[PDB]
Write a structure and sequence with these properties.
Number of helices of chain A: 1
Largest sheet of chain A: 5 strands, mixed
Strand order of the largest sheet of chain A: 2-1-5-3-4
Distance between the termini of chain A: 28 Å
Number of domains of chain A: 1
Helix content of chain A: 10-25%
CATH superfamily of chain A: Phosphatidylinositol 3-kinase Catalytic Subunit, Chain A, domain 1
Radius of gyration of chain A: 11 Å
Oligomer: homodimer
Strand content of chain A: 25-35%
Shape of chain A: globular
Chain lengths: 72, 72
Amino acid sequence: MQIFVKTLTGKTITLEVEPSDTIENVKAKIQDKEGIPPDQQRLIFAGKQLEDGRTLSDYNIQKESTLHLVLR
Amino acid sequence: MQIFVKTLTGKTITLEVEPSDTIENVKAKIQDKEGIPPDQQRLIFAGKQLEDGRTLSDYNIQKESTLHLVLR
């Protein structure tokens, strides 16, 4: 399924993922596309910070869901 | 001719270029000055993303023009 990630600068990125994909895997996909190291990235969905040891399905993230990316 | 590049942190860099210089060449000049690899840099002018296979003259960039640098 496709998901969207918005940046602090107003950019939107589209990613192809599976509900069984891990958050760490998602961060890795972002690194590949934007060059941002996973340790400097924070992912938020519906006001909650997503953990690297959990999956998309655990957060009930559905197709065309939009995640927010924060930089540290 | 001289041009200006602004960073996301509010820094302004001055570069010496020729209208026949390529965007890839411009990125290379930025790498030399800031240490940012060309693959992690995105250049925007008048709202348009500049391509690595095109030249400054193609975008009608004139002396004292200001470009915007984005990081990925």
